[PDB]
Design a protein around this nucleic acid. Structure first.
Length: 1164
RNA sequence: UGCAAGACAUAGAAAUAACCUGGUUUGAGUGUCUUGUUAAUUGAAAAAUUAACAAGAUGAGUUCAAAUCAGGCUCCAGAGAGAUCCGAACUUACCUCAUGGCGGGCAUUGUGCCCUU
DNA sequence: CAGGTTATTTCTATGTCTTGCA
């Protein structure tokens, strides 16, 4: 019937809506003015969830790896000890709780117990040194524990190299790498020292090496490239081997050991180079692996990492004895408080172990290194300066004092070093135990499989192997006929189709076209797409204000043919040269180029590349399809060239090996933004009868993509026909529609709540809005939704500053600290400003009448409409509705608290299905801060009196507690309640509760009491709002220095009157009905309020205002006046009796606020 | 002037993976000497060791194991076995299951009021 | 419950050369 507009202001925390007519007076239905504010907490990103998910998947893979290793050692372990694995698996439990009653986790056997196993080998790194540097037949358990530690500390997996390169020493390697060919030994110490010094970067190493080797003549560039290969940079072959025809591509290949390994670079250079593949040869790997394992004591690098961290252990012992000597003298008193007491940041805290006198070991959290160093420095202050004190302080500054072995600093260990250690362990133990040599069906050897499990890391493209379709996060495509069989190393290629899995990964990631939303996009390097870019750029190119083909027909074709076939970057000067060459006429050649930025940003690189690939000049259709598929495979597979090589060999047999090598050397990286079908869509028939396409239209005519998609173009009609438009029902937008467009979670919640308000308003009103005014990233998402549900409505974008200019110029103050109405006033102002600006200096636009056609927007005469907006601007009508949500999050803290601190019931046990951790939280610790999801109202009997209680449902029990019977059972057993009768099964967090005539927001729980926040917005006149704005500005960092004495007096008096108004609002108005009012405390504390200075007065005013706001916990820091920082807190007992409470209502509010149900908790 | 489609450059982020260092809890790495009290086996008694306490003194210390959201999935019962992936993100007013209802209306400075169920 | 690394894709600001709509 009538015509109405809806205005919308979205914020990450609040969403405000308003509805108006052409006269800017609000539509009101159900007797309620249709404008309000919906608040919701800022949504949380999936970063923490993703981190925890990858962490738990990593843990699961570690578990299966350890189980496999245990199964491989099980036969010999059981031969020597029946239950070693069970003792390993029952390490947490006390002696009684173990499956078998024993005392210590490892080496239970009599004689060789744990107490002297740790005496023989103080650490694991003492055992591994013994394993790799000895031949004596070791117990299978010792080898198992060494390999177990190696598995539990794998290493970087970031470097490329070979383990065996460390067997040959630096001297022998230098001898083998000194003048290998006919085109160093003396300086075999400084070079190695520079190479193995991690302090200097690669560039510094290269500069020092070039400075110190003093290269011979005629090899300066060759020696520079050799140094680049040595330290590791992208260096071409070039003069390394010195062929004359350097211009050839085979001798211009660039390779760096950082980007690729030797076995991967070799195929790219096999056959091309002379000799037995030759120039650094397996000496950079030695430098990388031996850089970390230096000693700086004898100058000789350690062979294996276990040889280090034993010398570090000895250095720790020497430093500890030095500090003990330095402490026993000069400080006989703080000996007990530092080396035995479990105080803060001392040695016992640095380790987490102490034994004062006979008492049990006190194991606590390990103190950080920084705190321990600070404590050592503080306790060294009492010691007068001496040699030992200076040396200790120098070591502390150097950071190599009292070092531990396992810590945050162990991130430098490469997997190759640990692999070498494992290989040595397995070779030493292989000469005695024969089970480590026996073969398998797949020709394994019981040693190669352990190494495989050590080294097999699932590639990033494969992702998780199994998916039960509970949620879509796996791509691993399994071979036909291969299912329900576990994925391990040595059968990854036989179970997961790696090529198909990578293809699925890339096509799932890649996005759809910007014009055809159902078909996927072409690779950027694809011939069609590159030709599209070049043709577009030629179309935009204009010469002296004329079209490129307007100068003479065939100019654009000539440029596309004879200027781009080279495939290189076409610059402006090259185009000028071509224009001079091809144009016989036009002697003057000062042709000004417009439409390009002096360089053609696109070039037919792929066309030329495939032209040299096939030798022919111009490709045909079959060769074009061949090249298109080759480019698609190279782009999808990317850095993994093995997939491309396999596809080429199994699909295109006519290609030669040199051609395959050339294909593998191409650089096809990124994806485009236009689909394949969009470029070849059949816009119309031509005169000859052949089809025309968008790409062919660019080729022939003089137009770009946007011109080809004009309103009258046949391509536009074909686009509308192909992109079928369905006006989906307003009531069919599930919140998964906005899950495709790449939006952050806060924006997603913004969009969903705002659209819910829109849907409720439109349904209630009856018909779609004529205009929907909205602010100017994620807002565009709702645009789509509007265009998917309300085709008639047109969105009138409003500038961000226009509304604020209206507020300042026409005197409508906004009070961001007072109440939440400013969102609704912002939406209504969006309506009134956007309507005027859509109808039409910037201020002058509001100085006269604005009217277009039959619709009148602004009437300056008598300010009639203006009066209306002002009468609406200050109205306290808006509805404030907080989102009622179940508190989704964690079950409890992710880190277990100590047993001596945990208490039963309040703390979640470690594992509530074992009957061991559940009833023994005081012994095995537990999880703290067990959060709850939602509240429920249950009627029970206490002291033979019928009373009702609101109680919590914890998050870890939400799924099993959503019906009346289940909640009754939960109250009956877990909460120890007699005769429960659950009356309300869902009271979400942040819900409107009417208690004793005052509105509350149920926002948590503190033990036996439930916590509430203020739900009544406080309204004050305009002058008070301006004063509060000044208060907020001054309390933010401004000063009173510029203010005059009269200004100070006026500020003091107006502050006093604002305080009086606030005090009265807490006494005579609704705020007096709150539980534990602050009015008496406001009046009692008023005496000291005047004596306070201006700035602290502003602070206490803002803190007082914090009591009457719905966006913060009701608490004030009135310490500047004399009260505590928790003044005016609201919390009421969870027991609802019939005496203390007059009306205990729950106001279930619809998201728009139009619909609401009041449930009487007392008598439901 | 806004919107948004194409190309380049400069700064970024986020979503999925893969991995590392770990961190937390628990448990293991026998603590040892003197003094006295208490309780034991003796012993008229003396004395005697043993064991738990309350003081004083002294030695060692670097590591390992298990989990690492509660849980969930499958199989035939349980302080199990399989799998190594689902679980900390987005969505949830209320009523009884439809593109339903959540009454007809007046205010909006203190949570009300008229007219019918 | 914190600090790092690797890969892919997408998105966002700003500037540059164009083009079309409301």
């Amino acid at each position: 019937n009538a015509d109405y507009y809806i205005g919308l202001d979205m914020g990450t925390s609040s969403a405000g809506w308003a509805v108006s007519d052409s006269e800017y007076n609000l539509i009101r239905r159900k007797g309620k003015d249709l404008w309000g504010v919906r608040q919701f907490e800022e949504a949380k990103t999936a970063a923490e969830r993703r981190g925890f998910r990858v962490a738990r998947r990593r843990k699961q893979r570690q578990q299966v790896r350890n189980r496999l290793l245990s199964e491989e050692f099980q036969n010999e372990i059981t031969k020597i000890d029946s239950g070693f694995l069970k003792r390993m698996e029952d390490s947490r439990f006390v002696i009684s709780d173990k499956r078998v009653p024993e005392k210590y986790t490892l080496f239970n056997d009599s004689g060789y117990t744990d107490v002297e196993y740790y005496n023989q080998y103080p650490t694991i790194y003492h055992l591994r040194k013994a394993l790799i540097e000895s031949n004596e037949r070791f117990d299978i358990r010792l080898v198992f524990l060494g390999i177990h530690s190696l598995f539990q500390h794998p290493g970087h997996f970031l470097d490329k190299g070979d383990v065996d390169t460390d067997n040959t020493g630096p001297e022998e390697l230098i001898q083998f790498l000194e003048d290998c060919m006919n085109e160093l030994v003396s300086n075999q110490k400084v070079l190695t020292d520079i190479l193995t010094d991690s302090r200097i970067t690669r560039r510094d190493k290269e500069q020092q090496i070039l400075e110190i080797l003093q290269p011979n003549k005629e090899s300066k560039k060759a020696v520079s490239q050799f140094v680049k290969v040595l330290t590791g940079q992208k260096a071409k072959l070039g003069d390394l081997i010195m062929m004359e025809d350097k211009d050839t591509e085979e001798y211009k290949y660039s390779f760096s050991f950082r980007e690729k390994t030797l076995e991967e670079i070799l195929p790219d250079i096999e056959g091309v180079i002379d000799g037995l593949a030759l120039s650094i040869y397996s000496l950079y790997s030695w430098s990388l692996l031996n850089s970390y394992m230096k000693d700086t004591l004898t100058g000789h690098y350690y062979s294996y990492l276990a040889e280090a961290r034993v010398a570090a252990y000895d250095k720790h012992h020497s430093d500890l004895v030095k500090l003990k000597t330095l402490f026993r003298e000069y400080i006989p008193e703080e000996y007990d408080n530092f080396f035995r007491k479990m105080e803060k940041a001392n040695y016992s805290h640095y380790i987490g172990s102490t034994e004062y006198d006979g008492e049990k070991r006190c194991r606590t959290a390990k103190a950080k290194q920084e705190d321990f160093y600070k404590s050592i420095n503080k306790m060294l202050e009492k010691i007068p300066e001496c040699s030992e004190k200076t040396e200790i302080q120098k070591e502390i500054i150097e950071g190599t004092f009292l070092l531990k072995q396992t810590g945050p600093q162990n991130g430098f260990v490469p997997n190759q070093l640990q692999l070498k250690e494992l290989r040595k362990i397995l070779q030493n133990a292989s000469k005695h135990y024969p089970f480590l040599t026996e073969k398998d069906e797949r020709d394994m050897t019981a040693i190669d499989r352990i190494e495989a499990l050590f080294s097999f890391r699932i590639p990033y493209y494969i992702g998780p192997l199994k998916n039960t379709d509970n949620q879509g996060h796996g791509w691993a495509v399994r071979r036909d006929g291969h299912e329900q069989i576990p994925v391990r190393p040595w059968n990854f290629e036989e179970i997961i189709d790696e090529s198909a899995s990578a293809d699925l990964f890339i096509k799932n990631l890649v996005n759809s076209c910007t014009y055809l939303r159902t078909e996927k996009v072409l690779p950027k390097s694809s011939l069609l797409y590159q030709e599209f870019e070049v043709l577009n750029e030629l179309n935009n190119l204009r010469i002296n204000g004329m079209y490129p083909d307007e100068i003479q027909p065939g100019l654009k074709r000539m440029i596309f043919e004879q200027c781009f076939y080279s495939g290189k970057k076409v610059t402006g000067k090259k185009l000028q040269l071509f224009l001079r060459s091809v144009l016989t006429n036009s002697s003057t050649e000062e042709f000004v180029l417009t439409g390009i930025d002096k360089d053609f940003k696109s070039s037919l690189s792929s066309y030329k590349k495939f032209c040299e690939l096939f030798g022919v000049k111009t490709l045909n259709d079959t060769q074009k399809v061949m090249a298109e598929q080759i480019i698609e495979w190279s782009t999808v597979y990317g850095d993994s060239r093995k997939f491309l090589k396999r596809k080429l060999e199994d699909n295109y047999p006519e290609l030669t090996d040199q051609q395959i090598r050339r294909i593998a050397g191409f650089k096809f990286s990124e994806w485009g933004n236009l689909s394949r079908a969009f470029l070849e869509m059949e816009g119309y028939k031509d005169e000859a009868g052949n089809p025309v396409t968008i790409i062919r239209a660019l080729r022939d005519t003089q137009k770009n993509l946007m011109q080809l998609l004009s309103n009258d173009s046949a391509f536009a009609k074909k686009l509308q026909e192909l992109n079928d438009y369905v006006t989906r029902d307003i009531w069919s937008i599930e919140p998964d529609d906005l899950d495709g467009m790449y939006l952050s979670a806060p924006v997603r919640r913004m969009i969903w709540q705002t659209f819910l308000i829109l849907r409720e308003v439109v349904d209630t009103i009856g018909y779609s809005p004529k205009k929907i005014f909205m602010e100017m990233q994620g807002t565009k998402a709702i645009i789509s939704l509007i265009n998917q549900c309300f085709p008639d409505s047109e969105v009138v974008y409003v500038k961000a500053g226009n509304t604020s200019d209206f507020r300042q110029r026409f005197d409508i103050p906004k009070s961001r600290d007072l109440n939440n109405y400013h969102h609704a006033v912002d939406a209504y102002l969006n309506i009134v400003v956007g309507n005027v600006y859509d109808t039409k200096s910037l201020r002058r636009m509001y100085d006269f009448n604005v009217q277009r056609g039959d619709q009148t927007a602004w009437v300056a005469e008598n300010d009639t409409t203006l009066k209306t907006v002002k009468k609406t601007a200050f109205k306290t009508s808006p509805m404030v509705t907080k989102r009622t949500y179940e508190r989704k999050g964690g079950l409890a803290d992710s880190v277990l608290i100590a047993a001596k601190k945990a208490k039963p019931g309040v703390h979640l046990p470690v594992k509530t299905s074992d009957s061991r951790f559940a009833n023994q939280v005081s012994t095995y610790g537990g999880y703290d801060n067990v959060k709850g999801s939602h509240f429920f109202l249950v009627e029970h009997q206490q002291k033979k009196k019928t009373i009702r209680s609101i109680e919590n449902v914890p998050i870890h029990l939400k799924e099993k507690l959503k019906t009346k019977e289940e909640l009754e059972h939960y109250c009956a057993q877990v909460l120890g309640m007699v005769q429960p009768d659950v009356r309300l099964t869902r009271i979400p967090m942040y819900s409107l509760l009417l208690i004793d005539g005052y509105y509350y927001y149920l926002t948590g729980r503190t033990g036996g009491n439930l916590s509430l926040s203020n739900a009544v917005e406080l309204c004050l006149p305009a002058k008070e709002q301006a004063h509060i704005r000044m208060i907020s500005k001054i309390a933010g960092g401004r000063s009173t220095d510029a203010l005059s004495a009269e200004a100070k007096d006026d500020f003091r008096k107006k502050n006093l009157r604002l305080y009086d108004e606030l005090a009265e609002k807490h006494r005579s108005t609704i705020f007096s009905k709150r539980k534990n009012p602050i009015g008496p405390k406001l009046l009692k504390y008023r005496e000291a309020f005047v004596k306070q200075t201006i700035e602290n007065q502003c602070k206490v005013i803002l803190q007082i205002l914090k009591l009457t706001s719905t966006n913060c916990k009701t608490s004030a820091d009135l310490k500047l006046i004399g009260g505590s920082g928790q003044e005016g807190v609201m919390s009421i007992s969870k027991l609802l009796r019939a005496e203390k409470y007059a009306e205990f209502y729950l106001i279930c509010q619809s998201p728009s606020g139009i619909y609401e149900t009041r449930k009487n908790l007392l008598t439901i």
